[PDB]
Structure 1
Amino acid sequence: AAQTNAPWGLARISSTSPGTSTYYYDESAGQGSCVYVIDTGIEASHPEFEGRAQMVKTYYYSSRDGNGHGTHCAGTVGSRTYGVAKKTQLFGVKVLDDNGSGQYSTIIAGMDFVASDKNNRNCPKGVVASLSLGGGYSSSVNSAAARLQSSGVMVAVAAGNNNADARNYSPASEPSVCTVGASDRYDRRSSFSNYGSVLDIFGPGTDILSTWIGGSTRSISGTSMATPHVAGLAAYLMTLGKTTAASACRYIADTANKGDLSNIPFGTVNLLAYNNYQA
């Protein structure tokens, strides 16, 4: 399949080179996989989700995404026009309030919730969780992300927008999950992206167009936007049978575009998520 005039990030993850405009992908598109978006919620009624999104848990008064961030990230995972894995099922877990903020204890609860809830869902191609969130280092946040990964979920987490070493941020610094830095359309590390030895991979993160609340769309930037490219890619590759939840991060690093990024500090991987799609 080919989506013409796709958002630059979708085009980038299906090209060895920057500057293309078509997103090339296998039509299986993540069908049969499930991605939990642990965030501000998902506006599941957005036409871009085609019925494939639903809220499954909220830690606040409503399950409505009053913010947009979670709807944006969910759209990069799996919306029709803006998503990597256009046929995945999306499950929203609202751990962040409508200002985009959330307590670590609630974030941890949402991770534990996903580890259990997946056992009640039919996700034959496997389960991913996208965590476009984070704050300062917390061993209990890292342990919760480690547990979620150990339970059989491919966990992708933002590296953080601090232009600093991700070792000081969580869940970014948990080694066992997939920590995702951000790049821009010219293959530079995004100016805000964290870096460091714990990063596993970069994905498109600057000026990413996706779904927003109110049935709308908008373009925002962050490691939050790069993370769902990787989560969506994992779901896509799991549906293809090329990898598993336990091995998807390593597989994505294995198969990434290597050495294409600029302003990568020595000791940070120079790896950009790539679907290796060949028609």
Structure 2
Amino acid sequence: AQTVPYGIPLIKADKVQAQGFKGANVKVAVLDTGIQASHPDLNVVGGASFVAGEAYNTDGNGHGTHVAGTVAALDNTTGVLGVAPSVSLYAVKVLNSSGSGSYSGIVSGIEWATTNGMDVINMSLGGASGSTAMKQAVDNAYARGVVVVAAAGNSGNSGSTNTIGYPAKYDSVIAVGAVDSNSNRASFSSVGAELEVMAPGAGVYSTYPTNTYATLNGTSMASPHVAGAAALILSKHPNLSASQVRNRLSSTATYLGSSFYYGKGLINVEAAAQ
């Protein structure tokens, strides 16, 4: 039997899936620790590794495979079910086995996705500072029509301090924070002016190596919900620009409280894909 993780109905991805829109032929690049391509619940169609010693289609860490399953776990009678179970999934490995990478590796991965005509870049990764090269890579990706999504940060709140990480903090990238199954903000979720939308992040069950399924918490889990949502909107309205898809996710989000903690609120892809 296929389990349906709470986040799938919470953002109403199931309502769009039932209309027949599943992200078919939408190309989504997951820039992460790789993907376990041989997982029975995942089809990885290509990608590239900017990490020395590791091929793009294995995942020693598990993080990239979990993030991939949330975008796109196959709709079948096993495992889990992704937000957009028909997307073309590309594994762009920019993070090693231990879950970290150079800004150079990341930049190379963004450029690879841009060069290769990805429709959506998902970055479930973050740093305290980012760089000039990274900025330009996300800007060029966005200007070229890619929807670029990143995890806001797992730094929580602390008085009035801005805790959004990079690349989420750049204007051209959707900073996604994290709610739980009760639609409440998870306490680890970063806060600040740049926070854009919320998606499910605490207690997220997805694909995990080897050939199994696991629960993780983090804005890393929330980001792919939004990446998938982007794919679903594209599959229903194929001519929308990256900026229109982004404005639809934003402007139709369910308000939850102060934008400092929630941005515009919880994505609702049914409302966004209308």
Give the TM interval when normalised to the shorter protein: 0.7 to 0.9
Preserved CA contact (<8 Å) 1:137 1:168 = no
Deviation at 1:166, TM superposition (A): 5.2
- Pair 1:58-2:49 in alignment: yes
The SS at the match of 1:276 is helix
The SS at the match of 1:247 is helix
Counterparts of 1:98-113 in structure 2 under 5 Å?
98-113=97-112
Amino acid at match of 2:206: S
Instruction: Give 2:27's aligned residue.
Output: 34
Q: 2:254 aligns with which of 249, 254, 257?
A: 257
The whole-number CA distance in structure 2 between the counterparts of 1:34 and 1:12 is 24
Preserved CA contact (<8 Å) 1:54 1:90 = yes
Q: TM-score, normalised by structure 1?
A: 0.85
- Pair 1:148-2:144 in alignment: no
The SS at the match of 1:258 is coil
Deviation at 1:73, TM superposition (A): 0.3
The SS at the match of 2:269 is coil
- Pair 1:69-2:68 in alignment: no
The SS at the match of 1:91 is strand
Q: 1:89 to 1:166 in 2, by over 3 A?
A: farther
Q: Which sections of structure 1, spanning at least 5 residues, go unmatched?
A: 16-22, 119-125
Amino acid at match of 1:142: K
Deviation at 1:4, TM superposition (A): 8.6
Deviation at 1:34, TM superposition (A): 0.7
Structure 1 runs (4+) deviating above 6 angstroms are: none
The SS at the match of 1:169 is coil
Deviation at 1:269, TM superposition (A): 2.1
Deviations 1:60-88, CA, capped at 9 Å, x for gaps: 21222111100000100011233100101
The SS at the match of 1:253 is helix
Measured on the aligned residues, the alpha-carbon RMSD in Å equals 2.3
Preserved CA contact (<8 Å) 2:21 2:235 = yes
The whole-number CA distance in structure 1 between the counterparts of 2:261 and 2:38 is 43
The whole-number CA distance in structure 1 between the counterparts of 2:260 and 2:53 is 45
Deviation at 1:211, TM superposition (A): 0.3
Instruction: Give 1:239's aligned residue.
Output: 235
Deviation at 1:167, TM superposition (A): 5.8
Preserved CA contact (<8 Å) 1:30 1:236 = yes
The whole-number CA distance in structure 2 between the counterparts of 1:166 and 1:71 is 30
Preserved CA contact (<8 Å) 2:44 2:91 = yes
The SS at the match of 2:150 is strand
Preserved CA contact (<8 Å) 1:82 1:211 = no
Q: 1:144 to 1:14 in 2, by over 3 A?
A: same
The whole-number CA distance in structure 2 between the counterparts of 1:201 and 1:110 is 24
Amino acid at match of 2:60: G
State percent identity of aligned pairs. Answer: 35
The SS at the match of 1:202 is strand
Q: Which sections of structure 2, spanning at least 5 residues, go unmatched?
A: 75-79
Preserved CA contact (<8 Å) 2:126 2:151 = yes
Preserved CA contact (<8 Å) 2:164 2:192 = no
Deviation at 1:151, TM superposition (A): 2.0
Q: 1:265 to 1:95 in 2, by over 3 A?
A: same
The SS at the match of 2:41 is helix
The whole-number CA distance in structure 2 between the counterparts of 1:127 and 1:113 is 12
The whole-number CA distance in structure 2 between the counterparts of 1:266 and 1:179 is 12
Deviation at 1:267, TM superposition (A): 7.2
Instruction: Give 1:133's aligned residue.
Output: 125
Deviation at 1:139, TM superposition (A): 3.5
- Pair 1:225-2:221 in alignment: yes
Q: 2:152 aligns with which of 151, 156, 159?
A: 159
Amino acid at match of 1:66: G
Deviation at 1:93, TM superposition (A): 0.4
Preserved CA contact (<8 Å) 1:142 1:173 = no
- Give the number of equivalent residue pairs: 258
Instruction: Give 1:9's aligned residue.
Output: 7
